[PDB]
Amino acid sequence: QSACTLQSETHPPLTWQKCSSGGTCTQQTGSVVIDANWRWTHATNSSTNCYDGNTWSSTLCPDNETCAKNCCLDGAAYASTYGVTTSGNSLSIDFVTQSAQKNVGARLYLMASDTTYQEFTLLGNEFSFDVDVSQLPCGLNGALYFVSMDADGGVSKYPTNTAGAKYGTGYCDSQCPRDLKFINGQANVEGWEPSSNNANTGIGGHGSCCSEMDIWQANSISEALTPHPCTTVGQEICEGDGCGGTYSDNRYGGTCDPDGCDWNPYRLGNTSFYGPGSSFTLDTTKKLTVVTQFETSGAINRYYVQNGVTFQQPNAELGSYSGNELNDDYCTAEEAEFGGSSFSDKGGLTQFKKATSGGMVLVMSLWDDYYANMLWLDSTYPTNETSSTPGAVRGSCSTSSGVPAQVESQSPNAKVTFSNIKFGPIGSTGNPSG
Ligand SMILES: O[C@@H]1[C@@H](O)[C@H](O[C@@H]2CO[C@@H](O[C@@H]3CO[C@@H](O[C@@H]4CO[C@@H](O)[C@H](O)[C@H]4O)[C@H](O)[C@H]3O)[C@H](O)[C@H]2O)OC[C@H]1O
Ligand SMILES: *[C@@H]1O[C@H](CO)[C@@H](O)[C@H](O)[C@H]1NC(C)=O
Ligand SMILES: [Co+2]
Ligand SMILES: [Co+2]
C-alpha cells in the first residue's frame, strides 16, 4: 500500500528508559503508531473506500496487486477516533471509542523515529514496565509483547509497500494472522471471507508469521507469560490453511507455535497470587511493576513489585518440574501434564532464543477475542472441561464471559495504562531513572 494524507499522521510521543550495567538509566524519546488494520484504506486519487465494513471494493481491489496499487492507508486521529493517548512515559488505550463510528481497541508499535520501529535485543537483557489493569474485566486483554518485525515494516523487501512503519505496516505474530488487509506489499483481498461475528473484519488467503514473545497478556483476573517459536524466526507470508494458528481451520498446520510455553500462575495452581483486592498477593485494583529477564541460557525469569514489595514468579510444581523459572524443564513438563507437542515441535526455547538474539518490535494492544472470548486466558478452556482436567482452569471468570458484543456494550470505558518502560542488562532496570 501507499500512504495518503487526507488526515495527518502525528505519532503520540512516549519516553522510556535505557539503563546500563554501570547502574544509571537515561531517557529515550520515542512514539507510538497504530497498526494499519485500524486505518482508513482508500483510493489514492479519491475518498472511495478500498475496504468497507468487512468487505473489499471489487473494482478497486480485483486482486492483491491491483488493490495495493490503487489503495493507500491514511492518518489516524489517535485520541478522538482510537482512544489512544500518551503523557510522558505513560500510554493509555480505551476499549470502545465512539466517533462518526465505533472503534474497538488498538494495536500499537513503539517507534525509533517517525518512519522506523524501535528494535530491542532481548537476550541477556531485562524489560520493566508499570501497568494498571484495574479497568480490565473478564474477556479483555491488555497486551504488551514483542514480535520479530522488520524495522521498516516491510518496505525494503516489498517496494509496493510505500507506507511503512510510519503507517504501522509489517505485522506478524505466532498466529500467522490472516485478518491482515496488507501483507508483503499486497492486499489480502484474494480468498477474503468476512467474519461471521465481527462487522469490521475477515480472513484472507495469506497470513504473516513470526516469533512472538508474550511478556504480558492480562486483565484484572488473569495474566500469562508466553514465548512462541517459529521455524522461520522473522516475518514470513504463509498460504491459506498452511498458515495454521487461530485464523485457520487447522491450528497446527504451519510454521509457528500458536500455543506457546505459557506460564499463568493461576493455571499452575496458585489462585491467590494475582487478582482484585487485598486477598491477592498482587492487588489488581492498583498499579503494579512487571520485570522480565532473558538469561543467555534462553530461560526466562520474572518478578513483580507493588508498593515497594518484591515477589518472584510464584513456585509451581508440575510433573517433575519444580521452581519459578520458565526453562526447558518447565516447558517439557507442561506438554507432559497439560498435553500438546506444538512448542517442542517448533524447537522449544532453543529456537526461540534465535528471536531474542535478534531484534524484536515492542507491541502494546487492547483487545477482545472474537474467536474464543478470552477463555483460554481467564476462564476454563475448553469449556466442557472441569477443574479435574490438568490445566483446564486458567482464571476465575465464567465460561460464559467475554462475548465481544456483550463486553463492548457493558464495558465500553474499559482501558489499560502502560507506563515507565525501562530496558537494559539484567540487574539494571531497578536503578533510578534519568
Ligand atoms: O474519515 C473516515 C475514517 O476515519 C474511517 O476510517 C475507519 C476507521 O476504523 C476502521 O475500522 C477499524 C478496523 O480495525 C478494527 O480492529 C480490528 C480488531 O481485531 C483485529 O484482529 C483486526 O485486525 C482489526 O482490524 C477496528 O476496531 C475498527 O475500528 C475502518 O475500517 C476505517 O474505514 O473511514 C471512513 C472515513 O470517512
Ligand atoms: C502464591 O504465591 C505467593 C508468592 O510466591 C506465595 O507467597 C503464596 O503463598 C502462594 N499461595 C499459595 C496458596 O501457595
Ligand atoms: Co499467494
Ligand atoms: Co537461570
Distances (CA, A) of 67 to 71, 207, 239, 304: 6, 17, 18, 47
CA distance 371 to 193: 15
Handedness of CA 60, 61, 63, 66 (dihedral sign): positive
The number of the ligand 2 atom at minimal distance from the alpha carbon of 314 is 5
Helices (H) and strands (E) in the chain, counts: 7, 33
Give the pairing of strands 309-312 and 300-306: antiparallel
Q: Do 66 and 58 meet the contact criterion of CB atoms below 8 Å apart? A: no
**Residue-number span of the structural domain to which 308 is assigned:** 2-434
Ligand nearest to the CA of 279: 2
Handedness of CA 310, 313, 317, 320 (dihedral sign): negative
CA distance 101 to 362: 28
CA distance 129 to 127: 7
Grid cell 480468498 in the structure block, residue: 191
User: What phi and psi, each to the nearest 5 degrees, are found at residue 155?
Assistant: -55, -50
- The count of residues in the chain is 434
Q: How far does the chain reach from its first CA to its final CA, in angstroms?
A: 40
Q: Which residues contact 37 (CB under 8 A, 6 or more apart)?
A: 107, 171, 179, 180, 181
CA distance 193 to 35: 21
Q: Do 131 and 419 meet the contact criterion of CB atoms below 8 Å apart? A: yes
Q: Do 422 and 433 meet the contact criterion of CB atoms below 8 Å apart? A: yes
The verdict on the CB of residue 338 being under 6 Å from ligand 1 is no
**Other residues' Cβ atoms within 10 Å of the Cβ of residue 96:** 18
CA distance 85 to 11: 10
CA distance 82 to 37: 12
CA distance 403 to 206: 27
Data resolution in angstroms: 1.9
CATH of residue 288's domain is: 2.70.100.10
Rounded to 10°, the helix 348-357/328-338 angle is 130
The verdict on the CB of residue 369 being under 6 Å from ligand 1 is no
Q: Which residues contact 427 (CB under 8 A, 6 or more apart)?
A: 21, 126
Angle 337-339-344 from CA coordinates, rounded to 5°: 105
Give the pairing of strands 316-318 and 321-323: antiparallel
Deposited experimental method? X-ray
Radius of gyration, CA atoms only, the chain? 21
The verdict on the CB of residue 365 being under 6 Å from ligand 1 is no
Nearest by Cα to 262 from 213, 198, 210: 213
Nearest by Cα to 169 from 355, 54, 47, 2: 2
For ligand 2, the distance from its centroid to the CA atom of residue 316, given in whole angstroms, is 10
Total structural domains within the chain: 1
Give the pairing of strands 274-275 and 282-283: parallel
Nearest by Cα to 350 from 211, 239, 166: 211
